[PDB]
Design an enzyme around this catalytic site. Structure first.
Site, PDB file in Angstrom:
ATOM      1  CG  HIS A 263      -5.317  10.095  -0.685  1.00 35.78           C
ATOM      2  ND1 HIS A 263      -4.053   9.791  -1.140  1.00 35.78           N
ATOM      3  CD2 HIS A 263      -5.638   9.136   0.213  1.00 35.78           C
ATOM      4  CE1 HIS A 263      -3.630   8.685  -0.553  1.00 35.78           C
ATOM      5  NE2 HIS A 263      -4.576   8.268   0.274  1.00 35.78           N
TER       6      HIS A 263
ATOM      7  CB  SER B   9      -3.899   5.242   0.540  1.00 33.95           C
ATOM      8  OG  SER B   9      -3.429   6.243   1.424  1.00 33.95           O
TER       9      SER B   9
ATOM     10  CD  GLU C 136      -1.692  11.282  -4.000  1.00 34.67           C
ATOM     11  OE1 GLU C 136      -2.277  10.942  -2.943  1.00 34.67           O
ATOM     12  OE2 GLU C 136      -1.669  10.565  -5.024  1.00 34.67           O
TER      13      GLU C 136
END
Lengths: 539, 529
Positions: free
Chosen positions: B438, B200, B325
């Protein structure tokens, strides 16, 4: 008739206009009655050109109704000399403005009790067509299904649809009025043939389907039929209608092109012109470079069409209507060889990406740059954005979806949502006898020969499976005509054909295999065409 | 006195600690200072190298976490708490950690440097999921991870000013990189084989080191997990950074750049934290207030321009995404979403949600997004709508930026490998509808399932070993495939667009990373935002 007593007593019929004598024709399974070339209007010639049809005045003696009459004056495709793929759609009788005649097929002898009537309205882009074409031969449905089948000629091109909206002398939509007059003729006279005027089903393909749709949307036509079938065409969509302003524009331009100057004097001058001159110039008035666009089509006149078809199908109550609608597998393929650079019937028509973009500009002539880009976006295979085969097939799909598939999905949706019983299909079988290249798939109009049952004629060299298939389709169509339901009430073994509903969006596939039920007619894509894109069509 | 635990670096001596990994011992050197503490007048300023020290510095324990917002959405919930600071908050936080095999490597070993994510407002190298002992023991790797400043402390910027130039969190990372270059050989690490990897915001950071010339001499390969320097959230313009800084200043009673920054430096850290979430321009998710700024210095241009014009011929890159995601972020601001039910939303809620997830969208753009993600066969089905909302956020913020980056890098000379991670942890505490959210590939990459006490399944342990092998193969050779050997993992190219699925089943090769949809985001929609 002095010779009546020596003739077939089973071929003499009286109608409102007088006596007629038909002919005994041979169908593979047995004889049928044909009454061909019946006048339903006064010849729309001379001072009657561009005018609404006038009912045919009664005649004396026995009208010879044994052969097809003249074809309405139209452009004749000579692009491919001797090629069956084009020639089978060309006129098979002399061209004349004197062409308002209809045809009736019945069993031989005629039915004893009232029999459901099918009325065929041919397509041909509102610039061509004839009821006398071999592919519209009513003898198979008559013999095998016992149907009473009627087909009419109607004026096409300028003769049928040139309009100076608001004028007395060229009000527009007179080809549709020809069709309507034939419908009224059937209402008064079909009982004399054993037909049931209280069970009349309209069916047509392409511009004929658009015509049927417009009879659905025009109140005076509604009391003249009870059910409708729309094959690969709709009253809504981008090609079936023009606005009054655009009609006036096109008519004015054509007039100037043939040397004519107040509406009255313009129209009169037009009436002095030879038919062939009008035909020779009708193709030079389109606003843009395009395919699947025709110069003289139904006009939103505020009369026959009280509003645009989209408005009428959006606000209409269709509760007492049963409709059968559908498309063929490859609606767009045909039109590509008629104006998109890189396409030909005689090679594989593999195109480049540049040719695809240009082709999108031609196939969606109203698209702004952004709209065109959106179409290119949706239809590009972004895993293989340069692949010529994918690009060719995508071009075909763009044209077919824009002009036929998504307008059909739109119509079916609106009708189902607003009361109508709807049945939907996709026709996926390619005729063994097709002379168009394999890459064109199942093109525009090549379901018709199966609906009319031509494969039942052994001399035409269809396969056995195709004969069976044709029999199946004939059964679907006549079942729908009779009951408003294509399913056989006696055949619970065969898979059923469910109604199309907004909730389940069910339609069936028509091919050599048994009925397969699918859901959503190109749903994502037609959402793209019908909900998102309409804002952006402006160039 | 264990000599394997005593190391001399340029700053002086360090004493590490012997840790127990399932397969055996590793050496850990935790809480090594690499910068002067960025406190007082050093707040908002670039990091200065750590001054040398006397005696033996204790490096047996994790140091403080950089001062940051702490998540309180679900107190006591593992799914959130596993990301929260696990040491004390402090602005005195510029420390790094080294894991090495025990005994110290005989020959120079490839070095892996982890950069944590957390939206540039949170994160720490001390989290259990970033535990480097497994990679060190099993693969014999040297692993480094650094703390870097986040939130206002790391990215508040008044562009053009001497006192708050922006990007100092990235400069923290860079200083740790140069530290590794200068010192890692003493731990048995190879300074000529350094691989950055992050997830990320960490991945976005890695990307920005790729795009910043002074960083480029400090590493040779890169892994970007679920994040990119390009895209809608990883960077802001100088004007927007200045706007947000000035607004934050206003919110804490501050008041000329110099005096504004001086006043900001007078404020207690928690004041700034208390107000950092009130400067975002719109209601949104996956948007963070203080992030890297296009300053014309660290970032000489926008990341989009730089990836478009860059020459990447001598770079190898591993990039990928997880299956869902967007899911995690829905419960942090989209009406109708919660971790405690199935979040079955209505169509109206879907449209509103799209407005929140794509805040730059014009009405036309938002309508286009709705059109594209609606299942027009089931336009009202709550399940479909929920999953669609997730896909909109995930594709807009991660998947399609990743596709674009991989494409550009490939087209301009880089060796690129791409994956999609599809295994849901058996131990996941987030609800099933969130799928593979995520960040939940990290624990497998770091090899946590090799710890039996964390009760993963046997298959998950085998899986973890596979992934550790892929990542360290890539670190070692620039190729995740086994240098000797199992279907091969092909390089990602613009023509074939091949990537692999990472799950319990053997590698499967797929082509096109959400190709139609990412064509929609990357080619069509940008005009309309």
């Amino acid at each position: 008739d002095p010779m009546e007593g020596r003739e077939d007593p089973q071929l003499l019929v009286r109608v409102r206009g007088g006596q007629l004598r038909g002919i005994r024709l041979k169908a593979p399974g047995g004889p049928v009655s044909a009454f061909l070339g019946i006048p339903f209007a006064e010849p729309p010639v001379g001072s009657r050109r561009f005018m609404p049809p006038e009912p045919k005045r009664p005649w004396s003696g026995v009208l010879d109704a044994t052969t097809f009459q003249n074809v309405c004056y139209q452009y004749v495709d000579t692009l491919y000399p001797g090629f069956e793929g084009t020639e089978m759609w060309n006129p098979n009788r002399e061209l004349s403005e004197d062409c308002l005649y209809l045809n009736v097929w019945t069993p031989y002898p005629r039915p004893a009790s009232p029999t459901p009537v099918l009325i065929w309205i041919y397509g041909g882009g509102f610039y061509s067509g004839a009821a006398s074409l071999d592919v519209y031969d009513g003898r198979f449905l008559a013999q095998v299904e016992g149907a009473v089948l009627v087909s009419m000629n109607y004026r096409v091109g300028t003769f049928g649809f040139l309009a100076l909206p608001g004028s007395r002398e060229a009000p527009g939509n007179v080809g549709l009025l020809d069709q309507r007059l034939a419908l009224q003729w059937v209402q008064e006279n079909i009982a004399a043939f054993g037909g049931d005027p209280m069970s009349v089903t309209l069916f047509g393909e392409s511009a004929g389907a658009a015509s049927v749709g417009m009879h659905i949307l025009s109140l005076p036509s509604r009391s003249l039929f009870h059910r409708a079938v729309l094959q690969s065409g709709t009253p809504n969509g981008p090609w079936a209608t023009v606005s009054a302003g655009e009609a006036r524009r096109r008519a004015t331009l054509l007039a100037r092109l043939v040397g004519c100057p107040n509406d009255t004097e313009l129209i009169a001058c037009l009436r002095t012109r030879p038919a062939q001159d009008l035909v020779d110039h009708e193709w030079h008035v389109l606003p843009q470079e395009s395919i699947f666009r025709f110069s003289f089509v139904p006009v939103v006149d505020g009369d026959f069409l009280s509003d645009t078809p989209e408005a009428l199908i959006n606000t209409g109550d269709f509760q007492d209507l049963q409709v059968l609608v559908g498309v063929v597998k490859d609606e767009g393929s045909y039109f590509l060889v008629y104006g998109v650079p890189g396409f030909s019937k005689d090679n594989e028509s593999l195109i480049s990406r540049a040719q695809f973009l240009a082709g999108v500009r031609i196939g969606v002539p109203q698209a702004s740059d952004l709209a065109a880009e959106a179409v290119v976006l949706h239809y590009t295979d972004w895993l293989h954005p340069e692949d010529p085969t994918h690009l060719r097939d995508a071009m075909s799909a763009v044209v077919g979806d824009h002009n036929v598939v998504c307008p059909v999905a739109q119509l079916a949706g609106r009708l189902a949502a607003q009361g109508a019983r709807v049945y939907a299909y996709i026709f996926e079988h390619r005729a063994s006898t097709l002379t168009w290249p394999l890459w064109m798939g199942v093109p525009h109009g090549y379901e018709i020969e199966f609906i009319f049952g031509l494969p039942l004629d052994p001399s035409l060299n269809y396969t056995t499976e195709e004969r069976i298939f044709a029999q199946r389709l004939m059964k679907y169509w006549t079942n729908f005509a009779r009951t408003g339901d294509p399913n056989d009430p006696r055949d619970s073994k065969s898979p059923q054909w469910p109604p199309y509903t907004t909730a389940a969006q069910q339609y069936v596939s028509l091919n050599l295999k048994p009925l397969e039920v699918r859901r959503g007619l190109r749903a994502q894509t037609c959402a793209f065409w019908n909900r998102f894109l309409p804002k952006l069509l402006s160039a």
